[PDB]
């Protein structure tokens, strides 16, 4: 049989090919003399239709189309970290090095990992010749980075007994590090495995999620928490801040590694990440280190060929599942699933398939469903026990800014967390622009055990916060018809603490040194003071409105204007300059100042 | 008997989303099933959606990825999709195709049944009458479920319909003055946390020895979801109509089922109904939903509570819309009540139960039940109207009576609707709470209740 067929026809990112009898659907296929990369989307006889992961302009009828047998797949091994890859796994740093160009050439075949690098390999010592071994077994560490120890492990399809294991030493992506036997058949392995991106990497179990995905943003971490192992969406119109949330999680979170997935995103975003992340630093064990060591970027900028958006999203999650199997609490920024759905619209349009809503294919809901649900907290495969997790955050971008959007409508049926952004907040430069009325998190019932163990006071505060923030909108619909003179003193206090919680708690200028991040202790300290003022002010009115000596919101403001100013000032406390005990001591002094002032009013 | 050997073909002339297009086929049947064997030797089942001469369009249940237009060995069974069934399916979990996913063996059949069932003769439908206490006042009082009723839970995305359905599965039973349901559960396209929630709850409640869960997770292939609810209902009909069981059938999301019909229908280039679903969605949903209720000479009975993720929160979307025409009412779970922390979030107004009037009265319930429900319902509706008036004309424009309807609305949501996750309130306790709320108004305001019923139950 022929290893290649021939291009029967072309239409944008679709290429039909003749002499393709015996092709497999979703087989990876090279197209054209320049060896474009693509994948078979349909079969129609002795003939195939290929989605092409580069722009086809220049492909000719009768060009060679070369089969490969393999489905779309990623190389996994040492040297992933800190790199940037396109949607078809080509490492952009090595493209830049080999070509010296400002642009990615069509037809580049650069190896997904730098097979020239001798990495330091540390075999597990527990393994030896004749030992039994199974998919997910860690045969050795590689000291890839000062942060991330890479934990090499047997490919999930593989099982057998150890024929050979390499001694401690330096090796690369072609050096044989392990050899198995199964059923009398030998199987050599290098440090690099390869995995089909469309097939889920399996696990021993998917557990419930029960540890907060700590995020720099107050409103997120306090009022709508994500969880390590949970999904999330950030639907927002253009310029709403969803990309800055996505940056902020990546820059500052308890995630052990981040895969960021620039699917159809503006190019300066990748430049901003690559500018900021080598210079920003975390700390481990008394060593400060560059956060890029704990990341990888999958990039596919908005002008790169539409099809590669699909391969990009599947690459980002497949890398995430690889690091999950190492026991890292992975996080993965799916930086726009609507621009992904638009790529599925494109291929569907070329295939002439029947569209569902707004031109999207009917399988969009099914593709999105089978993607976000690749998240979880997992008992890994294999023998040394690990609890890895993937957490997936999807920056949905609704066309026209309207949540009736089919991508949003599907996404909300799948994700356990909704951080719906409001363009009206973004217009006011209120950021992060999270609408607290429509947003929700389903994980609160699981996380409440963690808050009970570490922050027992918090669940009352979170409840009072959400309620005050709802009562504001309940009052607004009245005030807009009659004016503020209609309000009772309880209502004025409600609107004032809502204004504190809105303008000084929920508001956070994430590029500034003081709002860069916010520890939970700072976050609860701020919210605790604000709600302590609410309860004390409310109590003071309720205590005295039974008499002619009635306290009022204006009486409180005129006696306690400095306290309102101190409460507003709480956001400016800086974790680099101020210790947790120092910030907490200042907040205790605010509680005492409030109590002594209210004791003088009552 | 299948005394003749099965044919097999390597004639896959096309592969197109979920469709495999065979050719050179001899005498195919519509709805026949096939075992595709891939190049790697793995097995995928499919069902014939169309035939014409030598050509047959196979729908593939385990998804089409890896199928090959020369190597794919496709084995025809000669027959339609019959599931095995037995009472041993209780105390177990299965995937949507009907294979085991616990450690246990395949089902050892007491019989084979066509998953489509067979039309129950209308003459033989015994009318539903016994009310089920679900334990939730909002669906035991102001609405009720008859044993044999088809009454789905409509819910928007993110709402606590899981907690409602599981609360029903814990609590629900006949009115007291061996008997408990076997619960057949089918999950279509569920998120893992939903799968875990039910799978855990049946085991943690200890009732697992009398239930049967079909699971299809969101990451299981789309087309399997087409079988999944019909498979479950076939298990329900076996247990009920042949083994006398009272069965409760829970379907977890008919929207992820309707999306599966949309996906294959789109791939078939079929003429669409509204929102691009197949135009046959109504008859298709009917062959699922109508498979319920007691039959002549049996004691056995199937109650269905299908659950349905209302897309974009829209009650008029075709999936809930067509369902409402087939199901004997609905229970509606509302974002507004959920945002107000009212658990369960059941909006009693658009909630309806066509059989409820026949399930209530002396000997079935306390004799006040019908009257109390009608009065409470009208009061809640007037409550929502005066709540809008509090903005549009102002609180100062409300009369003392409108303020009583506003007080009623508040107290009603706080006490009538709000249950907590384990409070198994009796119908009797629900009507006591009903009167304790009606007691807010002067006796003469209660225009929906007869003066005899008021004289017996208002002065309490």
């Amino acid at each position: 049989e022929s290893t290649f067929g021939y291009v029967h026809g072309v239409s944008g990112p679709v290429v039909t090919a003749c002499d393709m009898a015996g092709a497999a659907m979703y087989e990876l296929v090279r197209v054209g003399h320049s060896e474009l990369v693509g994948e078979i989307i349909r079969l129609e006889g002795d003939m195939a239709t290929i989605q092409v992961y580069e722009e086809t302009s220049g492909v000719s009828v009768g060009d060679p189309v070369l089969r490969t047998g393999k489905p779309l797949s990623v190389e996994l091994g040492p040297g992933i970290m800190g790199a940037i890859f396109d949607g078809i796994q080509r490492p952009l740093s090595d493209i830049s090095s080999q070509t010296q160009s400002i642009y990615i050439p069509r037809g580049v075949n650069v190896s997904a990992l730098s097979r020239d690098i001798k990495w330091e390999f540390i075999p597990s010592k527990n393994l030896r010749v004749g030992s039994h071994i199974t998919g997910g077994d860690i045969y050795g560490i590689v000291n890839e980075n000062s942060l991330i120890k890479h934990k090499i492990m047997l490919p999930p399809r593989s099982r057998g007994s150890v024929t050979y294991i390499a001694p401690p030493g330096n090796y690369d992506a072609s050096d044989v590090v392990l050899e198995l036997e199964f059923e009398g058949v030998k199987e050599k392995l290098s440090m690099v495995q390869v995995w089909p991106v469309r097939q889920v990497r399996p696990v021993t179990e998917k557990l419930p999620a029960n540890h907060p995905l700590l995020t720099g943003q107050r409103v997120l971490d306090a009022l709508f928490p994500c969880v390590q192992g949970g999904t999330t969406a950030i639907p927002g119109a253009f310029g709403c801040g969803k990309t800055v949330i996505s940056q902020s999680l990546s820059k500052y979170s308890n995630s052990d590694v981040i895969i960021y997935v620039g699917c159809g995103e503006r190019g300066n975003e990748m430049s901003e990440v690559l500018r900021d992340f080598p210079e920003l630093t975390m700390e481990v064990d008394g060593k400060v280190e560059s956060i890029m060591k704990r990341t990888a970027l999958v990039a596919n900028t908005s002008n790169m060929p539409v099809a590669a958006r699909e391969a990009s999203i599947y690459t980002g999650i497949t890398l995430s599942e690889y690091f999950r199997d190492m026991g890292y609490h992975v996080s993965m920024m799916a930086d726009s699933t609507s621009r992904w759905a638009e790529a599925l619209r494109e291929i569907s349009g070329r295939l002439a398939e029947m569209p569902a809503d707004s031109g999207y294919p009917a399988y969009l809901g099914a593709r999105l469903a089978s993607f976000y649900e690749r998240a979880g907290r997992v008992k890994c495969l294999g023998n040394p026990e690990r609890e890895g997790s993937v957490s997936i955050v999807g920056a949905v971008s609704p066309p026209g800014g309207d949540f009736s959007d089919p991508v949003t409508s599907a996404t909300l049926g799948i994700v356990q967390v909704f951080w719906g952004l409001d363009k009206k907040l973004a217009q006011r430069k209120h950021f992060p622009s999270v609408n607290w009325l429509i947003s929700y998190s389903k994980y609160m019932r699981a996380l409440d055990e963690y808050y009970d163990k570490h922050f027992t006071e918090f669940v009352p505060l979170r409840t009072k916060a959400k309620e005050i923030l709802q009562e504001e909108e309940d009052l607004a619909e009245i005030v807009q018809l009659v004016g503020k003179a209609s309000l009772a003193e309880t209502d004025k206090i409600t609107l004032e603490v809502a204004k504190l919680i809105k303008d000084d708690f929920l508001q956070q200028n994430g590029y500034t040194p003081y709002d860069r991040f916010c520890p939970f202790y700072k976050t609860v300290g701020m919210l605790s003071n604000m709600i302590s003022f609410y309860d004390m002010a409310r109590r003071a009115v309720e205590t005295t409105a039974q008499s002619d000596n009635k306290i009022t919101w204006s009486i409180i403001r005129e006696h306690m204007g400095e306290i309102l100013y101190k409460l507003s000032s709480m956001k400016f406390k800086d974790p680099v300059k101020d210790g947790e005990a120092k910030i907490k001591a200042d907040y205790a002094q605010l509680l005492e100042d409030m109590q002594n002032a209210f004791r003088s009013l009552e | 008997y299948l005394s003749q050997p099965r044919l097999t073909y390597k004639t896959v002339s096309g592969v197109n989303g979920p469709l495999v297009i065979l050719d050179h086929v001899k005498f195919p049947r519509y709805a026949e099933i096939v075992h595709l064997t891939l190049p790697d030797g793995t097995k995928r089942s499919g069902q014939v959606l169309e035939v014409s001469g030598s050509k047959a369009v196979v729908q593939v249940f385990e998804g089409t990825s890896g199928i090959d237009a020369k190597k794919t060995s496709c084995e025809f069974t000669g027959d339609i999709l019959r599931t095995p069934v037995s009472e041993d399916m209780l105390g177990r979990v299965f995937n949507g195709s009907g294979k085991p996913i616990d450690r246990g063996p395949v089902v050892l059949a007491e019989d084979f049944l066509d998953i489509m069932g067979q039309p129950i003769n209308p003459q033989c439908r015994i009318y539903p009458e016994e009310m089920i206490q679900t334990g939730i006042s909002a669906i035991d009082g102001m609405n009720s479920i008859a044993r044999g009723q088809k009454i789905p839970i409509f819910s928007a995305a993110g709402l606590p319909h899981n907690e409602i359905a599981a609360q029903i599965c814990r609590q629900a039973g006949l009115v007291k003055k061996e008997e408990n349901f076997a619960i057949v559960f089918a999950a279509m396209g569920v998120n893992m946390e939903t799968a875990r929630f039910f799978k855990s709850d049946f085991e943690e409640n200890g009732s697992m020895d009398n239930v049967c869960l079909f699971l299809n997770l969101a990451n299981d292939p789309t087309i399997e979801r087409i079988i999944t609810p019909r498979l479950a209902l076939t298990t329900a009909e076996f247990l009920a109509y042949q083994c006398e069981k009272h069965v409760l059938v829970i379907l977890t999301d008919m929207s992820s089922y309707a999306e599966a019909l949309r996906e294959v229908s789109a791939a078939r280039e079929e003429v669409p109904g509204r929102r691009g679903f197949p135009g046959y969605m109504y008859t298709d949903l009917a062959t699922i939903y109508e498979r319920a209720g007691r039959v002549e000479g049996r004691n056995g009975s199937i109650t269905q509570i299908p659950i349905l993720t209302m897309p974009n929160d829209d009650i008029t979307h075709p999936i809930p819309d067509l369902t409402g025409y087939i199901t004997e009412g609905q229970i509606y779970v509302d974002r507004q009540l959920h945002n107000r922390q009212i658990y369960p979030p059941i909006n009693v107004l658009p909630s309806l139960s066509r059989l409820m009037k026949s399930a209530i009265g002396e000997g079935m319930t306390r004799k006040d039940h019908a009257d109390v429900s009608n009065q409470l319902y009208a009061c809640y509706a007037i409550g929502k109207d005066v709540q809008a008036m509090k903005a549009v004309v102002g609180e100062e424009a409300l009369t003392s009576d409108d303020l009583l309807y506003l007080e009623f609305l508040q107290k009603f949501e706080k006490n009538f609707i709000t249950q907590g996750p384990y409070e198994n309130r009796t119908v009797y306790e629900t009507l006591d709470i009903g009167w304790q709320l009606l007691r807010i108004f002067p006796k003469e305001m209660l225009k929906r209740i007869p003066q005899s019923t008021l004289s017996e139950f208002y002065p309490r």
Partner: peptide, 23 residues
């Protein structure tokens, strides 16, 4: 309109192919 336009084009293609199959 778009779904019906595509249905109508698919029918036209199927008609043309069905007449070609008379040979």
């Amino acid at each position: 309109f778009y779904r019906l336009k595509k249905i109508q084009e698919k029918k036209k293609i199927i008609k043309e192919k069905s007449e070609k199959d008379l040979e």
